[PDB]
Amino acid sequence: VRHIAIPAHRGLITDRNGEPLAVSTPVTTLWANPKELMTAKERWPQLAAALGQDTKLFADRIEQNAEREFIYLVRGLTPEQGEGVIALKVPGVYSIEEFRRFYPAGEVVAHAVGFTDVDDRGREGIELAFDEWLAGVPGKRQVLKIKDVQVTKNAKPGKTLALSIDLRLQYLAHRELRNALLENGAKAGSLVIMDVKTGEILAMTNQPTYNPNNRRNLQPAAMRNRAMIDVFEPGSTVKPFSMSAALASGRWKPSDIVDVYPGTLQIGRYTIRDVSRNSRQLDLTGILIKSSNVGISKIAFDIGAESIYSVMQQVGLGQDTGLGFPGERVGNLPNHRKWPKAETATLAYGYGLSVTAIQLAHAYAALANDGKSVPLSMTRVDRVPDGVQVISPEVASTVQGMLQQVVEAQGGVFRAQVPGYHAAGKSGTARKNAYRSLFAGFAPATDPRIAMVVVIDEPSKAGYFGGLVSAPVFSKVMAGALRLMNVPPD
Incomplete structure (x- = not known):
């Protein structure tokens, strides 16, 4: 027997x-x-x-x-x-x-x-x-x-x-990312779309990809779930969280001015140096549009790193996503007792830490959801969990408006503009002269529904920054995602 x-x-x-x-x-x-x-x-x-x-x-x-x-x-x-x-x-x-x-x-x-x-x-x-x-x-x-x-x-x-996952948004994201990788001759890329209200991941595509129905000649590079595994310094894309801390401190308002002349700031032995050095007085929106590391550094010295670190921790940066997927990396949000000027500045302009595209999308979802974080989900959410109010609704609203100006104002990321709608977001460049082009945003800007992160790994054409490499992909995929979800044009 x-x-x-x-x-x-x-x-x-x-x-x-x-x-x-x-x-x-x-x-x-x-x-x-x-x-x-x-x-x-x-x-x-x-x-x-x-x-x-x-x-x-x-x-x-x-x-x-x-x-x-x-x-x-x-x-x-x-x-x-x-x-x-x-x-x-x-x-x-x-x-x-x-x-x-x-x-x-x-x-x-x-x-x-x-x-x-x-x-x-x-x-x-x-x-x-x-x-x-x-x-x-x-x-x-x-x-x-x-x-x-x-x-x-x-x-x-x-x-x-x-x-x-909405398979209709997943096909749009897969196609638009694939097309952007070949136009920029890039190695690899990620695109995450999130519902800002529900914590739902509506799309997660990585390039290169593979057919799981035929894994005969399966290269490990094609298998890599980059959105959840690749960690990078998020650079200018976390400046909206530095700004959230500045507006919550009681010491800063959007019309306040910072003198960033001459595009450099000596802090003892180290010198902070801006990507563009053609400014003196900038308002807080201007500091974001120019991505002035000097501008956000002076604000960070005024408010203290502790306030910025706390916002970044609360929106989930360098923290477990709770999604329980095989490879996923949590990255690193470094903490200190004593924050010197250098570590204060580097945290503020986003080199003081490493995150995944999923954590970055999740943080943008909280900001888009008028400051309320909702746990990430890869499964359909019928009953929305209670959020945590991590940023005051008023600060979140103010920072949303600044990010809309980043996309729409003169001197701003016009390629991120979404045909049909008001969008909000921030480009970034994370050096590995190999780098990742980033764009992180949400729409509609005035009443957000969708948060999105685009990562383009080593764009190998003339076009350098997040503001022309990643931003147009966000434009096309966001226009498509909002209409597939019958979100009314604003």
Whole structure:
């Protein structure tokens, strides 16, 4: 009496609208009892020829395993192809019906969904993260070795999982990122779209991508879930959080002026140096438009690093996302007892830390959601968790308006402008002369619905900054995402 396990049917993964993303598909695994096979050797060359194997290599396998009362031959043939072999009627050739995953959207949502191993266990993406929920519990039955004595346990199927992903926005993001990588001859890239109200990840695409239905020649670079794994210094894209701290201090208002002449600031031995050095007096919006490191450094010395560090920590920078995905990196938000001037300045202009595109999107979602953080979700949210109010609604509103001016004002990031709508955001450049071009923003600016981060890894064409490399991708994908979600033009 042997106990043999009945595989459970793995749960269906859908997008937020019920579009199938991962489906357990019937296949046939052909095993054999060598000791039986050993009695039908004249059938072997026909079995071999069928099974794709070579006659002598196949004969060699069976002969040495002449002791074992079981071994596999082939796993997950089609039901009717593996029947053309059950049609040879070779003694000792029995078969199991099994499930394999199919991924209808393939490379478009590869990293987010991931894939299963040969045992049908989650190995990447959601397949891994919700392996328990999807796998179910296999059943078993007592068998003589002849006859199935009884089902001693019932194989219960895995449960259905609806992702936060909108496959329509995922196709738009995948296509627009792919096109931007080839126009800038870039190595790699990420694009994350979030619902600012619900914490839902509506799209997560990485380039390069792969077909999880065919992982034969799978390069590790194609497999890398960059949005959740790649850490970088977010540079000018975290200046809105430095500004949030400045406006919450009671010492700063948007019409306040900082003298950034002559584009440099000596702090003892170290000199802070602006990317553009053609300014004296700038208002707070101007400090953002110019991305003046001098401007944000003087504000940071006035308010203290502690206030900036606290805002950055509260919007989740350098913190666990709680998404429980395989590779994900948390990055680093460094803390100090005593913040010297250098570390105060570098934190303020975004080199004092490292973040992922997902953390950066999540921080932008909090700012867009009038200062209320909502936990990240890769699964459809029906009941929205209570937020944490991490930035006062009034500060969040003021910083939103500044970021709208960053995109729309004269001297601003005009390429980020969204045809149809008011958008808000900040470009950045994170040096690895290899660098990442960043853009982080949300729309509509006056009533935000969507936050988005674009990362372009080593753009290898003339165009340098976030403000012309990443910003146009944000424009096209945001215009598309807002209309697919029937968000009314403002």
